[PDB]
């Protein structure tokens with residue numbers, strides 16, 4: 001085949017992909033069977049299942065050449081922010097897009113942008129935060145004036161690659177579709193900037209306050225402004241979904257992300273950065289930080305998402321609580337959350 005995947009575990013990959021439409025899909029096994037091409041394998045899976053290749057005349061070869069390229073622009077050596085995360089966000093977005101409240105709502109084009117924005121939203125992530133880049137006066141921080149530095153990068157890179165040889169997956173869209181898709185993708189990726197979370201949520205609460213559904217229970221969004229607000233929150237939720245998965249998978253994400261944060265602390269030390277030293281693996285509590293994050297950021301977000309789509313998200317939300325309660329139970333420089341909240345200034 002094209003993924004070079006072995007006849008050995010082709011049944012495995014096929015059987016794992018049966019839960020492609022489910023929140024409890026295991027992206028980790030999928031990466032195993034794909035030879036570490038989860039982003040490409042899942043995206044291809046997603047696009048077939050929604051028939052996006054056919055609808056937009058995106059040939060298989062074009063899609064795969066682009067997706068392979070894009071996946072290569074993610075750093076497998078960065079602990080959390082590699083192609084596996086990207087793959088997980090796209091699959092999570094794929095699931096959200098099809099909940100009963102939501103499924104009839106979005107146009108094929110809108111569906112295309114959301115899943116694509118998901119795929120690209122972290123491409124070429126260096127392993128460090130926006131603030132780290134700012135404080136080191138990296139070329140990126142200067143290029144984007146210290147505002148949504150990386151998110152501006154992920155977009156630029158995601159669209160740039162469309163120009164490589166046989167990589168233009170949007171080649172057969174009209175001029176109007178390409179600019180509609182582009183405005184939407186831009187919106188959704190910039191939406192992933194965490195310093196935008198609170199204003200994201202504020203607006204979502206509003207969507208909920210005045211939500212109306214059809215006779216069928218389908219949410220009603222009559223202007224571009226509304227459905228792009230749902231979309232951008234959808235992708236931010238998906239971005240923030242780790243703790244809503246089966247505890248065993250949430251544990252694997254947490255190991256990865258903590259590795260990546262503490263590795264940012266090592267880089268800050270190596271470089272004699274600022275002065276203010278972040279707590280390390282020994283002095284920090286990962287358990288406290290999780291519960292702080294779930295209470296301060298994740299749950300307030302998911303609870304609101306659950307209102308918008310009542311009761312589509314209940315099993316998701318019941319798992320979040322369970323998971324919070326489980327990190328809770330394990331609870332015994334400048335800490336994880338002290339750092340995340342300070343540099344939200």
Ligand SMILES: CC(C)(C)CNC(=O)Cc1ccc(Nc2nc(-c3ccccc3)ncc2C(N)=O)cc1
Pocket residue numbers: 128129130194239240241242243253254257261264289290292293336337338339340343
């Ligand atoms: C500010 C920073 C923490 C140094 C770097 N972070 C960034 O550049 C943005 C960023 C990237 C990913 C996440 N996701 C997550 N962030 C946390 C977290 C917990 C306590 C304090 C801070 C963070 N926990 C879990 C996830 C999870 N499992 O999804 C949150 C923020």
Ligand SMILES: [Ca+2]
Pocket residue numbers: 121122192193
């Ligand atoms: Ca990001």
Ligand SMILES: [Zn+2]
Pocket residue numbers: 085089121122192239
């Ligand atoms: Zn992300």
